Amino acid sequence: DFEEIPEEYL
Amino acid sequence: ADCGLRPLFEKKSLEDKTERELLESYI
Amino acid sequence: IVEGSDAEIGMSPWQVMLFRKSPQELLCGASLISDRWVLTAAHCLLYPPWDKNFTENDLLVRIGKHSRTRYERNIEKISMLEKIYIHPRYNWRENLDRDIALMKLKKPVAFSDYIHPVCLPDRETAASLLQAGYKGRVTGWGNLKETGQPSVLQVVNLPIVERPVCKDSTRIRITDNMFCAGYKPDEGKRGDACEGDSGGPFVMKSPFNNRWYQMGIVSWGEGCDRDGKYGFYTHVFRLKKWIQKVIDQ
Ligand SMILES: N=C(N)c1ccc(CNC(=O)[C@@H]2CCN2C(=O)[C@H](NCC(N)=O)C2CCCCC2)cc1
Ligand SMILES: *[C@@H]1O[C@H](CO)[C@@H](O[C@@H]2O[C@H](CO)[C@@H](O)[C@H](O)[C@H]2NC(C)=O)[C@H](O)[C@H]1NC(C)=O
Ligand code: NA
Ligand code: NA
Questions:
Q1: Which residues of C belong to the active site?
Q2: Closest CA to C212 of A4, B11, A2
Q3: If C1 and its partner were Cys, which of C41, C133, C153, C154 is the partner (CB 3.0–4.6 Å)?
Q4: Which H or E run includes C85?
Q5: d(CA C101, CA C219)
Q6: Taking a C-beta distance cutoff of 8 angstroms, is the pair C116, B8 a contact?
Q7: Do domains C1-12+118-237 and C13-117+238-249 have the same CATH topology?
């Protein structure tokens, strides 16, 4: 249920 | 340093809704 | 947090979320102590009874958050860990004695309206504030109940409880490196930290200089918000010499 985080943070 | 002083509260002289409860407990 | 309230925006700018990369989930709370150092509970990173043994590369620190689940674009800052430091005498076998850990950030975090470090107490701030009846504040994205999850950061104010009362509430041996907080059944008011709140800060606002100090770290309890039971916290000032040593490097 956690929104995806920008790819830049691995 | 500027530790423990909140930009949206102490830095603006604004109080949050319950901090007075903490102060009132420091008898 | 059980029996708390939604935090106000920027109310706890030192609040840190410890986030597991895979699967994407809340690991623990934590706190920002400088632009490069994050403070948490050792059991958030190392807990052999539950096969917990996280390394630097397994997690991320999310700073400046309010919403538990959403990616707070232009508000939160996500950082990677350079190094984890667990207290060398952390007692995970028995009672979580010295439940404390430091995490060095790869890059310094930039301060903002939502991101700001909390103070660490000196001997006098500790002596003057750590008194039975004096209230502190606990924050976190943990369970709303013992047996669901909040949408936003939760807050609860809780009084420090007398050492004999803490000791008499449990079968677990209590040390000088811990203190307990919470209301008695007679007091009326309720509240407690719970699973997912671990590692988070127990803070107090100094009436002398109006700055917030981190006096405790959410450590353990037996259930959440049970009558006659109290939440236990790592006593930060008692372990400050270890903190200073690791930061001084
Ligand atoms: N009510 C609180 N204030 C509270 C309760 C739990 C937590 C989360 N912390 C943990 O789960 C850590 C790792 C082991 N542990 C526990 O709390 C154990 N209880 C586990 C439990 N579910 O009660 C606790 C049992 C007594 C001996 C020490 C360990 C944080 C705050
Ligand atoms: C937790 O995990 C670490 C690995 O991240 C274990 O550390 C290893 O320990 C052995 C001996 O016990 C050393 O020879 C290795 O070089 C270690 N590796 C690192 C990266 O430190 C550790 O033993 C695990 N369990 C506990 C209970 O701490
Ligand atoms: Na006892
Ligand atoms: Na209780």
A1: 43, 99, 198
A2: B11
A3: C154
A4: strand C77-86
A5: 11
A6: no
A7: yes
